[PDB]
Design a protein around this ligand. Structure first.
Ligand SMILES: [Cl-]
Ligand SMILES: [Hg+2]
Ligand SMILES: [Zn+2]
Ligand SMILES: [Zn+2]
Ligand SMILES: [Zn+2]
Ligand SMILES: [Zn+2]
Lengths: 36, 36, 36
Protein backbone atom coordinates (compact mmCIF):
# COMPACT_ATOMS: atom_id res chain seq x y z
CA UNK A 1 0.00 0.00 0.00
CA UNK A 2 0.93 3.71 0.46
CA UNK A 3 2.75 3.01 3.82
CA UNK A 4 5.96 1.73 2.11
CA UNK A 5 5.78 4.56 -0.52
CA UNK A 6 5.17 7.36 2.05
CA UNK A 7 8.08 6.13 4.21
CA UNK A 8 10.35 5.97 1.08
CA UNK A 9 9.27 9.53 0.14
CA UNK A 10 9.86 10.80 3.72
CA UNK A 11 13.38 9.19 3.74
CA UNK A 12 14.30 10.85 0.38
CA UNK A 13 12.99 14.28 1.61
CA UNK A 14 15.26 13.95 4.74
CA UNK A 15 18.26 12.90 2.55
CA UNK A 16 17.64 15.87 0.11
CA UNK A 17 17.36 18.28 3.12
CA UNK A 18 20.66 16.98 4.64
CA UNK A 19 22.38 17.40 1.17
CA UNK A 20 20.99 20.94 0.90
CA UNK A 21 22.56 21.88 4.30
CA UNK A 22 25.96 20.53 3.11
CA UNK A 23 25.53 22.48 -0.20
CA UNK A 24 24.74 25.72 1.79
CA UNK A 25 27.94 25.17 3.87
CA UNK A 26 30.03 24.88 0.61
CA UNK A 27 28.33 28.09 -0.67
CA UNK A 28 29.31 29.86 2.61
CA UNK A 29 32.97 28.69 2.17
CA UNK A 30 33.08 30.33 -1.31
CA UNK A 31 31.49 33.54 0.06
CA UNK A 32 34.17 33.63 2.84
CA UNK A 33 37.00 33.07 0.23
CA UNK A 34 35.55 35.76 -2.13
CA UNK A 35 35.40 38.48 0.62
CA UNK A 36 38.94 38.00 2.04
CA UNK B 1 -5.10 8.91 -2.51
CA UNK B 2 -2.24 9.39 -5.06
CA UNK B 3 -2.95 13.19 -5.39
CA UNK B 4 -1.10 14.09 -2.13
CA UNK B 5 1.75 11.62 -2.98
CA UNK B 6 2.18 12.83 -6.61
CA UNK B 7 2.29 16.48 -5.45
CA UNK B 8 4.88 15.56 -2.73
CA UNK B 9 6.96 13.71 -5.38
CA UNK B 10 6.70 16.66 -7.84
CA UNK B 11 7.82 19.11 -5.05
CA UNK B 12 10.88 16.92 -4.18
CA UNK B 13 11.84 16.60 -7.92
CA UNK B 14 11.75 20.47 -8.20
CA UNK B 15 13.82 20.84 -4.97
CA UNK B 16 16.41 18.22 -6.22
CA UNK B 17 16.61 20.03 -9.63
CA UNK B 18 17.18 23.45 -7.92
CA UNK B 19 19.96 21.84 -5.72
CA UNK B 20 21.55 20.30 -8.82
CA UNK B 21 21.76 23.79 -10.51
CA UNK B 22 23.47 25.20 -7.36
CA UNK B 23 25.86 22.16 -7.34
CA UNK B 24 26.70 22.78 -11.08
CA UNK B 25 27.47 26.46 -10.26
CA UNK B 26 29.93 25.33 -7.47
CA UNK B 27 31.53 22.88 -9.97
CA UNK B 28 31.97 25.78 -12.46
CA UNK B 29 33.66 27.91 -9.71
CA UNK B 30 36.24 25.13 -9.13
CA UNK B 31 36.82 24.77 -12.90
CA UNK B 32 37.41 28.57 -13.13
CA UNK B 33 39.87 28.45 -10.13
CA UNK B 34 41.72 25.40 -11.60
CA UNK B 35 42.31 27.06 -15.05
CA UNK B 36 43.63 30.45 -13.78
CA UNK C 1 -1.33 2.65 -10.15
CA UNK C 2 1.82 2.46 -7.92
CA UNK C 3 4.04 1.28 -10.89
CA UNK C 4 4.46 4.84 -12.33
CA UNK C 5 4.94 6.31 -8.79
CA UNK C 6 7.50 3.65 -7.68
CA UNK C 7 9.52 4.15 -10.89
CA UNK C 8 9.41 7.99 -10.39
CA UNK C 9 10.57 7.52 -6.76
CA UNK C 10 13.38 5.11 -7.82
CA UNK C 11 14.56 7.64 -10.51
CA UNK C 12 14.65 10.52 -7.93
CA UNK C 13 16.58 8.32 -5.39
CA UNK C 14 19.21 7.56 -8.14
CA UNK C 15 19.42 11.30 -9.08
CA UNK C 16 19.80 12.32 -5.35
CA UNK C 17 22.53 9.61 -4.89
CA UNK C 18 24.46 10.85 -8.00
CA UNK C 19 24.22 14.49 -6.65
CA UNK C 20 25.47 13.33 -3.25
CA UNK C 21 28.60 11.74 -4.87
CA UNK C 22 29.32 15.05 -6.70
CA UNK C 23 28.79 16.96 -3.39
CA UNK C 24 31.25 14.56 -1.59
CA UNK C 25 33.85 15.23 -4.36
CA UNK C 26 33.48 19.06 -3.81
CA UNK C 27 33.88 18.47 -0.02
CA UNK C 28 37.10 16.48 -0.72
CA UNK C 29 38.45 19.39 -2.89
CA UNK C 30 37.97 21.82 0.05
CA UNK C 31 39.64 19.36 2.46
CA UNK C 32 42.64 19.08 0.05
CA UNK C 33 42.86 22.95 -0.24
CA UNK C 34 42.58 23.38 3.58
CA UNK C 35 45.47 20.92 4.35
CA UNK C 36 48.03 22.30 1.82
CL1 LIG D 1 32.06 23.62 -3.54
HG1 LIG E 1 17.91 15.45 -3.82
ZN1 LIG F 1 33.88 24.67 -3.50
ZN1 LIG G 1 29.86 37.64 -2.10
ZN1 LIG H 1 39.41 21.57 -15.59
ZN1 LIG I 1 40.24 19.35 7.34
Amino acid sequence: EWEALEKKLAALESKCQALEKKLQALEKKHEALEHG
